[PDB]
Design a protein around this ligand. Structure first.
Ligand code: CLA
Ligand code: CLA
Ligand code: CLA
Ligand code: CLA
Ligand code: CLA
Ligand code: CLA
Ligand code: CLA
Ligand code: CLA
Ligand code: CLA
Ligand code: PQN
Ligand code: SF4
Ligand code: SF4
Lengths: 80, 124, 38, 144, 740, 153
């Protein structure tokens, strides 16, 4: 489906999973940040790509990118 | 398991829901209450855990987000596959995703510049 | 005091100056024609 | 009930009660020699309808409305604060105010002595004085 | 019921006016963006987006009520002034036919004096279509002095309301308890406003009718008209003009009501002298409405214990398909200021349309039916007013599920069901819309095909006899035989549009038995199509505003939001306010087709002239007996022949209605800039201009940004409507003046 | 294309326009005061045609003109109706620019764009001789900018 790629601009303020609808991203301990959190998206098969994390993403250029890819039932958000 | 009663049809008896994977949530519900479904009107919440059927994943997570704002209750959502495969996709760590956990890993993570360079040096 | 601050707002100043510019032109087309001399 | 609104209300009462008295003492003064004497031939030439739309008095009223503007543009800020404008009449009045308070024990609030009664009497009397003489041609019923 | 007042809550100070955006701390600390400039005005009237204290929201809307009320009074006080300083109402009072209406003059500045239409009566100006002269003649106003006294009396009432909306607020303030008295509110709106209002005006047109009826209809000069007080000061004058006034409220107590039959009648139809309804039937009408409202204004609990109440009335209505029906609706309307506004906008919006229909059907004012420009203008005027109002009803009935609906507090299982089987309501309306579209407009495609194809339209004539004069024909025949039979006390029909072959003419045709035919079944179903689609999209915005299948967490985003993003294939324009934005557009199409239908069909078969050598010759003689069935006739004989009255007017005084006609297409196509492009490209467009602004540092501190995604669509519909009304506003005011 | 004082096809339009206006003029009584102003309006009409005749005007009666720079027609373009637009517009523009220079300082930038002290608006009259002084200050604008612009990346 969609391709989630995390920039190196992360501050770890958990804005992803707070905004994110179906919890695509996930906070993971990391050793190269101020707060110490990093966003990671294992369940990219279930990602829909609604692009609501780029709104809550603080950085000048956003830190969580999701490039538009293929479309499946998991990424169309349809109930049928 | 005792589940809230809802009238109005719409949600049930859909062929697509039967042939497609379905979602099953639950909540503690220590007290009798009254809530609203993300796709229905109003319904009374009974004591103990309550199992429902959901056809979308966003429908399965918005209800948990709405429950967390009411009272403080741990949520459990289980995501079933087409045949009969039942896997715990929600809270596989059992730790809340925004909060920090010990079980850490990285999936699909490129550590390059910000303007672009879409090639990934290593997938794992 | 504060009435002058409300008088100093963007819409009030804009309408006041535009009233001046419009009235000058209404009086211009009513009074002398442009003489224009080669 | 509020402060700043009742301020302009009581002020407008004072700002017109003196106007509603100098006009009465002006309209009566100009007609003191022609009140009666055969009812001044129904006000004679003083009838407003008989005037020539104020040809000669219009350019004079414009000058009056101009000077009266800045007169009240002095009354608007002189009321603001006590100092300068109102403070000098302040201690002037305080010279009769001290004697008046001595006659009236602790303070004798002058506003109860006659600030509201004069203010409202002038307004009501001038409102009726402008209708009986300027707002009735055919009486139909006798006016008593 | 208790006098609970919170005297002095907000002080009178210019401090808030000094701060641009004092109503919201979010719109005050950060005015660094151009978008903030538009947000300051977009949320300026969204009072529920500031503070949540209902005691203050009720003390911010009743203020806006008195403010808007003062604006309306300032507006009305000028109408009596314009019909006295520069107008022709007195000359028109003496000569009503030859003197065209006018109450607006221009000045010699840039040669614009060509707009001074030669109307007559020794005064030139701009023709008016507001019905002011008909209303003033029906009010007994003759002299110019009676205009100025009413205007100077309007200034007083206009000032008192400003000093009232500034009284119950900066000076006084009732508590929150004063607003849950909805029971005490309907007892004063249906009896104090509707009741005493229908009685006060009733008592007027009984003593002011004879200066119009038994005088101006006889043939007396306006100078020979006696004074209205001379009729009251001498009861015998009223007694001679009406031989029932000699009694003077004596059989009123004796219940000998028949002795008041000289002013109180139920004739029906129109009067063959004035040109409108009877001047005696309306007086009896308002008397009948007044007593009915004096009875209907006593229905709810005051502070004596008797009567019903909106509470238990709705707590008692049940129903099998409703379940816990009607209960909780009291808590629905008594808690949300919004909630009352949709049912008000809905009822009052349909009311403006219904009263617009009642205007042309039975003309209530004298010399109104012959005044074709005024009649045509007033109908479509209230028509579009109600269109906006009903869409506002949808705009706020969508607000309710988002802003004030809870799954614990306010509860009606009826509204619950409207949201529980919500997918069924719109499914029904959807199939109804499609059936009424693929046929009503399908038959348009069909007939337009039959003509260009050849002999198919010839064989369609038998079907043209079908549908038309098949239905609704018997309804008119019922109304023909309704007087005498089912109306023994009525010597005329409801209107002469019902009485067959009965034509009333006063040198110009007033009303006609509107013989349906050819394509009235066509346009009425084009209407029903554009009505069901409008109701569908607005009701969709109503009940889908809370629970949506696509996005479950809908209540978090809001009402006037853009969308969610490119996910799920594409979530775009899913807000209920957008169902209103597009609901404004289908209402636009509905009202556009209805005003087209009414306007043109009138001069097609109703409006015309009369000669003695013949009978009836219309302005456009019976054209839409064929030119209405196909789409081509709607721009071959309708939209085409109208350019000869809007453009061929530069040599006359109707040149402004051509400039506005051609200039309204400009602003309409200017709406095609916002309704098609996107903020992304335009935001990339500013930063280049901002680069030029950073080259000379002429960049403003307020950072240049594009319009909001929602504000662009709000301005887009604003121009699509303004540019989509001013054209027909210039068109309805084009031909009707040339063919008047 | 001949001038209209010699173009016989232009004076005919004056006669024809007054002829169309005369039918509207004669239906009302000239002795009435509300229509005595029509004679003053046609006086304005008459006083308008004579000045345009001096300008070269179309033979058709549609009065054309010159923008090539011909010194005989500088009145229709170059000198009056053109240069004043440039000066008056830029007297506003460079005055706005001077206000943009004083748009910073301590008091908030938003306060100094919108809620400005009226005194700056009263100082606007400063720009009597913009040209070269404005050129100096615009040089300084480009200079102190030091090519500080947006990324465009
Ligand atoms: C050379 C200066 C001058 C002169 C001689 C006039 C003269 C006149 N003006 Mg005018 N006016 C002026 C400057 C001037 N104005 C300026 C600078 C403005 C603002 C830009 C206006 C705006 C204005 C308006 C809006 C109107 C007039 C009007 C009038 C006429 C009568 C009403 C009046 O203004 O009474 C005295 C002036 C004051 C009390 C002030 C009158 C012949 C009225 C008119 O007849 O319309 C054409 C009218 O409506 N003027
Ligand atoms: C909203 C009501 C309204 C509207 C639309 C108009 C419109 C108009 N008035 Mg008017 N007027 C009004 C109320 C109104 N008036 C009231 C309540 C009074 C006091 C009784 C007057 C007294 C008055 C006088 C004495 C004169 C006019 C004149 C005029 C015309 C000249 C335009 C102008 O200068 O005003 C400005 C127009 C606007 C600012 C736009 C309309 C405002 C709405 C709210 C927007 C114009 C068509 C002049 C005229 O026609 O010459 C004979 C004239 O001399 N008016
Ligand atoms: C700025 C110019 C201007 C102004 C101030 C007015 C003002 C007025 N016109 Mg008018 N009109 C105009 C231009 C103008 N008109 C033009 C160019 C035409 C085409 C020739 C007309 C044609 C026209 C007709 C046919 C009629 C009027 C009427 C009226 C009066 C009714 C009040 C009203 O409509 O409120 C304003 C209405 C609004 C919708 C504006 C409010 C919305 C926001 C503020 C914009 C009013 C005093 C009526 C009347 O009876 O005259 C006394 C009437 O029937 N007008
Ligand atoms: C059953 C209600 C009803 C009906 C059928 C009428 C009908 C009529 N009214 Mg009326 N009116 C009513 C209630 C009603 N009114 C009330 C309650 C008031 C007090 C506010 C008024 C105050 C009023 C005034 C001041 C005037 C009229 C006038 C008129 C006549 C022309 C106006 C019009 O067509 O709009 C009709 C309005 C409606 C159809 C809406 C009423 C529907 C209710 C809610 C049911 C018309 C025959 C005019 C007139 O007398 O003609 C010369 C006039 O000037 N009415
Ligand atoms: C001439 C252009 C045009 C045409 C032919 C249509 C045709 C149609 N529209 Mg549409 N619409 C248009 C312009 C047009 N629209 C524009 C410009 C807008 C923007 C405001 C919309 C917004 C719109 C909405 C929001 C909806 C429609 C719907 C419909 C369908 C109604 C079902 C029906 O009766 O089928 C009849 C077939 C023919 C008449 C042919 C129909 C096919 C409704 C729908 O989908 O069905 C319920 C629907 O909800 N339209
Ligand atoms: C019993 C006294 C009475 C009288 C004398 C009138 C007289 C009139 N009414 Mg009326 N009406 C009345 C009672 C009365 N009404 C009552 C009790 C109601 C219900 C509240 C209405 C509701 C009503 C409406 C909705 C309308 C009128 C209208 C009219 C006018 C149209 C002329 C006509 O066809 O006759 C009578 C009119 C009828 C509709 C038939 C009688 C009323 C009901 C339906 C029977 C007319 C002057 C029309 C109007 O306002 O003109 C623009 C209009 O549309 N009336
Ligand atoms: C910068 C490019 C540009 C320009 C200059 C115009 C200019 C114009 N367009 Mg246009 N348009 C454009 C781009 C442009 N358009 C694009 C890209 C599209 C989409 C393809 C459209 C689609 C479009 C449509 C659908 C229509 C226009 C129309 C018009 C005319 C409106 C008439 C008018 O009021 O003028 C000024 C005339 C006056 C009398 C001024 C009124 C003065 C008042 C009274 C004050 C006008 C001359 C309308 C038209 O006239 O049809 C030909 C029309 O309906 N345009
Ligand atoms: C570039 C050519 C052009 C364009 C793009 C338009 C576009 C439009 N015209 Mg127009 N028209 C044109 C040429 C054009 N016209 C010409 C040459 C004439 C003859 C002079 C007319 C005479 C005309 C009239 C009389 C009317 C329109 C109307 C309309 C609008 C229809 C409103 C609507 O869609 O609701 C739905 C309409 C239907 C479903 C039918 C629309 C925006 C109507 C309007 O603007 O209403 C405000 C209207 O009344 N036009
Ligand atoms: C047709 C519209 C119009 C007209 C006739 C004028 C006319 C004029 N403007 Mg002006 N201006 C306009 C629109 C217009 N402006 C607009 C839309 C803006 C932007 C809001 C400005 C902003 C502006 C500024 C900043 C200044 C002028 C100034 C001037 C005057 C220059 C001569 C002088 O007094 O020094 C002049 C009379 C100058 C002026 O008079 O200073 C007060 C001045 O500096 N204008
Ligand atoms: C033009 C355009 C813009 C930009 C719109 C802008 C910049 C609005 C400009 C309006 C203002 C009022 C013009 C600037 C005038 C200043 C206020 C100065 C006025 C000072 C005096 C004249 C009073 C969008 O943001 C947009 C968004 C989505 C789809 C299409 C579009 C679109 O087409
Ligand atoms: S959006 Fe970016 S900066 Fe914010 S918490 Fe997620 S990874 Fe960190
Ligand atoms: S791509 Fe969409 S669903 Fe996935 S994390 Fe980002 S906002 Fe959430």
């Amino acid at each position: 489906a969609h391709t989630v790629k995390i920039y190196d601009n992360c501050i770890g303020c958990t804005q992803c999973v707070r905004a994110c609808p179906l919890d695509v991203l996930e906070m993971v301990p990391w050793d190269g940040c101020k707060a110490g959190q990093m966003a990671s998206a294992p369940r990219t098969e279930d990602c829909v790509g609604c692009k609501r994390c780029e709104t809550a993403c603080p950085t000048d250029f956003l830190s969580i990118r999701v490039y538009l890819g293929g479309e499946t039932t998991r990424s169309m958000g349809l109930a049928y | 398991m005792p589940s809230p009663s809802f009238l109005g049809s719409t949600g049930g008896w859909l062929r697509c829901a039967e042939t497609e994977e379905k979602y099953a949530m639950t909540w503690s519900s220590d007290q009798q209450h009254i809530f609203e479904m993300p796709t229905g009107g109003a319904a009374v919440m009974n004591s103990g855990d309550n199992l429902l059927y959901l056809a979308r994943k966003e429908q399965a997570l918005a209800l948990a987000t709405q429950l967390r704002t009411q009272f403080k209750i741990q949520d459990y959502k289980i995501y079933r596959i087409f045949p009969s495969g039942e896997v715990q996709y929600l809270h596989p760590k059992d730790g809340v995703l925004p909060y920090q956990v010990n079980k850490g890993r990285e999936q699909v993570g490129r550590v390059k510049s910000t303007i672009g360079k879409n090639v990934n040096p290593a997938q794992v | 005091m504060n009435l002058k601050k409300y008088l100093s707002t963007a819409p009030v100043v804009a309408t006041l100056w535009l009233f001046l510019t419009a009235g000058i032109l209404i009086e211009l087309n009513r009074f002398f024609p442009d003489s224009l001399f080669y | 009930t509020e402060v700043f609104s009742l301020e302009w209300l009581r002020e407008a009462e004072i700002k017109h009660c003196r106007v509603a008295m100098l006009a009465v003492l002006g309209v009566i003064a100009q007609e003191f020699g022609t009140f009666d004497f055969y009812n001044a031939k129904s006000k004679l030439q003083l009838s407003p309808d008989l005037h020539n739309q104020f040809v000669q008095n219009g350019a004079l009223q414009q000058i009056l409305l101009f000077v009266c503007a800045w007169e009240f543009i002095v009354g608007l800020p002189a009321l603001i604060e006590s100092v300068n404008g109102n403070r000098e009449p302040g201690y002037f009045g305080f010279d009769p105010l001290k004697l008046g308070g001595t006659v009236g024990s602790a303070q004798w609030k002058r506003m109860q002595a006659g600030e509201l009664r004069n203010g409202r009497l002038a307004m009501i009397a001038f409102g009726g004085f402008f209708h009986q003489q300027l707002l009735t041609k055919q009486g139909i019923i006798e006016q008593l | 019921v208790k006098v609970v007042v919170d005297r002095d809550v907000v002080p009178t100070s210019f401090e808030k006016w000094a701060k641009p955006g004092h109503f919201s701390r979010s719109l005050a600390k950060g005015p660094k963006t151009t978008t903030w400039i538009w947000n300051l005005h977009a949320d300026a009237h969204d009072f529920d987006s500031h503070t949540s204290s209902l005691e203050e929201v009720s003390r911010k809307i009743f203020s806006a009520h008195f403010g808007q009320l003062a604006i309306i009074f300032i507006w009305l006080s000028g109408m009596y002034f314009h019909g006295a300083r520069f107008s022709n109402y007195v000359a028109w009072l003496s000569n009503p036919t030859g003197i065209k209406p006018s109450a607006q003059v221009v000045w010699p500045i840039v040669g614009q004096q060509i707009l001074n239409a030669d109307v007559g009566g020794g005064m030139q100006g701009i023709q008016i279509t507001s019905g002011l002269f008909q209303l003033w003649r029906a009010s007994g106003i003759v002299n110019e002095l009676q205009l100025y006294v009413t205007a100077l009396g309007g200034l007083g009432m206009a000032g008192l309301m400003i000093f009232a909306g500034w009284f119950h607020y900066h000076k006084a303030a009732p508590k929150l308890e004063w607003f849950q008295n909805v029971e005490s509110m309907l007892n004063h709106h249906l009896a104090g406003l509707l009741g005493l209002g229908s009685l006060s005006w009733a008592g007027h047109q009984i003593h002011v009718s004879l200066p119009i009826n038994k005088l101006l209809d006889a043939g007396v000069a306006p100078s020979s008209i006696p004074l209205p007080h001379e009729f009251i000061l001498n009861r015998n004058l009223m007694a001679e003009l009406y031989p029932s006034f000699q009694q003077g409220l004596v059989p009123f107590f004796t219940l000998n009501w028949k002795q008041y039959s000289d002013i109180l009648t139920f004739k029906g139809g129109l009067s063959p002298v004035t040109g409108g309804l009877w001047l005696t039937d309306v007086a009896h009408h308002h008397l009948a409405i007044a007593v009915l409202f004096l009875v209907a204004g006593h229905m709810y609990r005051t502070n004596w214990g008797i009567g019903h109440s909106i509470k238990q009335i709705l707590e008692a209505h049940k129903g099998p398909l409703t379940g816990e029906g009607h209960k909780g609706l009291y808590e629905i309307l008594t808690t949300s200021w919004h909630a009352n506004l949709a049912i008000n906008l809905a009822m009052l919006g349909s009311l403006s349309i219904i009263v617009a229909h009642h205007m042309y059907a039975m003309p209530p004012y004298p010399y109104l039916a012959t005044d074709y420009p005024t009649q045509l203008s007033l109908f479509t005027h209230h028509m579009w007013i109600g269109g906006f109002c009903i869409v506002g009803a949808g705009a706020h009935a969508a607000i309710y599920m988002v802003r004030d609906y809870s799954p614990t507090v306010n509860f009606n299982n009826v509204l619950d069901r409207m949201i529980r089987h919500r997918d069924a309501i719109i499914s029904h309306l959807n199939w109804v819309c499609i059936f009424l579209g693929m046929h009503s407009f399908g038959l348009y495609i069909h007939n337009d095909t039959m003509r260009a194809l050849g002999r198919a339209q010839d064989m369609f004539s038998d079907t043209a006899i079908q549908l038309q004069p098949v239905f609704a024909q018997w309804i008119q025949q019922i109304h023909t035989l309704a007087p005498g039979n089912t109306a023994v006390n009525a010597l005329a029909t409801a209107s002469y549009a019902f009485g067959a072959d009965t034509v009333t003419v006063g040198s110009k045709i007033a009303m006609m038995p509107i013989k349906l035919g050819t394509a009235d079944f066509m346009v009425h179903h084009i209407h029903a199509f554009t009505i069901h689609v409008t109701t569908l999209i607005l009701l969709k915005g109503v009940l889908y505003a809370r629970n949506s299948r696509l996005i479950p967490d809908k209540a978090n985003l809001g009402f006037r939001f853009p969308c969610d993003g490119p996910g799920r294939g594409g979530t775009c324009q899913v807000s209920a306010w957008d169902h209103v934005f597009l609901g404004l557009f289908w209402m636009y199409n509905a009202l556009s087709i209805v005003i087209f239908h009414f306007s043109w069909k009138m001069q097609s078969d109703v409006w015309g002239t009369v000669t003695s050598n013949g009978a009836i010759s219309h302005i456009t003689g019976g054209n839409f007996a064929q030119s209405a069935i196909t789409i081509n006739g709607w721009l071959r004989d309708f939209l085409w022949a109208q350019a000869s009255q809007v453009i061929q007017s530069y040599g006359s005084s109707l040149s402004a209605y051509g400039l506005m006609f051609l200039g309204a297409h400009f602003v309409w196509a200017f709406s095609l800039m916002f309704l098609f492009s996107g903020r992304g490209y335009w935001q990339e467009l500013i930063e280049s201009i901002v680069w030029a602004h950073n080259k000379l540092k002429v960049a403003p501190a307020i950072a240049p940004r594009a319009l909001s995604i929602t504000q662009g669509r709000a301005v887009g519909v604003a121009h699509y409507l303004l540019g989509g009304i001013a054209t027909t506003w210039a068109f309805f005011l084009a031909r009707i003046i040339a063919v008047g | 294309l001949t001038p209209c004082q010699q173009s016989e096809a232009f004076h005919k339009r004056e006669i024809n326009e007054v002829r169309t206006l005369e039918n509207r003029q004669a239906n009302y009584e000239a002795n009435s005061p509300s229509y005595l102003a029509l004679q003053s309006q046609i006086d304005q009409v008459h006083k308008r045609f004579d000045k345009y005749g001096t300008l070269l005007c179309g033979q058709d009666g549609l009065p054309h003109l010159i923008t090539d720079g011909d010194w005989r027609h500088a009145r229709e373009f170059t000198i009056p109706a053109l240069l004043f637009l440039y000066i008056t517009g830029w007297i506003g523009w460079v005055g706005r620019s001077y206000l943009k220079y004083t748009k910073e300082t301590k008091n908030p930038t938003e306060q100094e764009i919108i809620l400005d002290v009226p005194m700056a608006l009263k100082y606007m009259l400063s720009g009597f001789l913009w040209p070269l002084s404005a050129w100096q200050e615009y040089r300084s604008g480009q200079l102190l900018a030091k090519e500080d612009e947006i990324t465009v990346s």
